[PDB]
């Protein structure tokens, strides 16, 4: 009813939950600000899909994020995949399908793992 | 699972391809085709003991 999509994010044993609902642009991880959540040097890496999308995509929404499990690199990676998959699914359910294809084409065009839980697998040379 | 794989023969003749074929007025094959006899020179004769 109310504009709401909910999207996971996957790593080895990091996993993250994010809730994309309508807003004016607030973003918090566990309730604390995004510019506060990381080992602060990876904060740019987390900032990435924002910097490809342009903020006005993020202008109309509001995201809560949950993360849990695992270490730091694991966590930040989970946050970014939740950001990406969540904003794609929010556009899917609530604006133009051509705009969803726009974000997906652009973001995937940048980096593959921002949309796929490509799992670390166990196939050495046999 | 399909069947037991059974041994099976099929006796060929020495006729041409267009003789083996089904019923048409004129084959898709041209003229360089229409003469090979379904069996190689190895088939028509094998030098052996």
């Amino acid at each position: 009813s109310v504009q709401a999509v909910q999207v996971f994010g996957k790593k080895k044993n990091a996993t993250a939950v994010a809730r994309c609902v309508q807003g004016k642009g607030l973003i918090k991880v566990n309730g604390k600000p995004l510019k506060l959540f990381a080992p602060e040097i990876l904060r740019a890496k987390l900032y990435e899909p924002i910097l490809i999308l342009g903020t006005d995509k993020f202008a109309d929404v509001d995201i809560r994020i949950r993360v849990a499990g695992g270490g730091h690199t694991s966590q930040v990676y989970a946050v970014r995949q939740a950001i990406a998959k969540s904003i794609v699914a929010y556009y899917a359910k609530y604006v133009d399908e051509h705009s969803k294809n726009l974000l997906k084409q652009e973001l995937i065009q940048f980096d593959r793992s921002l949309l796929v839980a490509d799992p670390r697998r166990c196939e050495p040379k046999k | 699972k399909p069947k037991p794989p059974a041994p099976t023969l099929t006796v060929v003749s020495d006729v041409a391809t267009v003789a083996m074929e089904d019923a048409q007025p004129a084959t898709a094959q041209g003229v360089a085709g229409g003469e090979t006899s379904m069996i190689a020179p190895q088939e028509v004769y094998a030098p052996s003991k």
């Binding site: 999509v5 909910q6 999207v7 996971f8 998959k85 794609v88 699914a89 899917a92 359910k93 | -």
Partner: protein, 58 residues
């Protein structure tokens, strides 16, 4: 039970490997009784996932 099952299949929610299912007498061999599962995106799948809280609309 077989009411829910049969009605479910009539409105078509059960893929078998790749095909869909309309005709509730598709006999299922022992080899196929693993690859039965639910279809591309149905609300039954989302009943499952809405319950176990892995509901991810993507």
């Amino acid at each position: 039970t077989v009411q829910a099952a049969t009605k479910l299949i009539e409105q078509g929610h059960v893929r078998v490997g790749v095909e869909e299912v309309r005709d509730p007498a598709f006999l299922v061999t022992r080899n196929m009784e693993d690859f039965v599962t639910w279809t591309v995106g149905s609300k039954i799948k989302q009943n499952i996932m809405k319950y176990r809280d892995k509901l991810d609309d993507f």
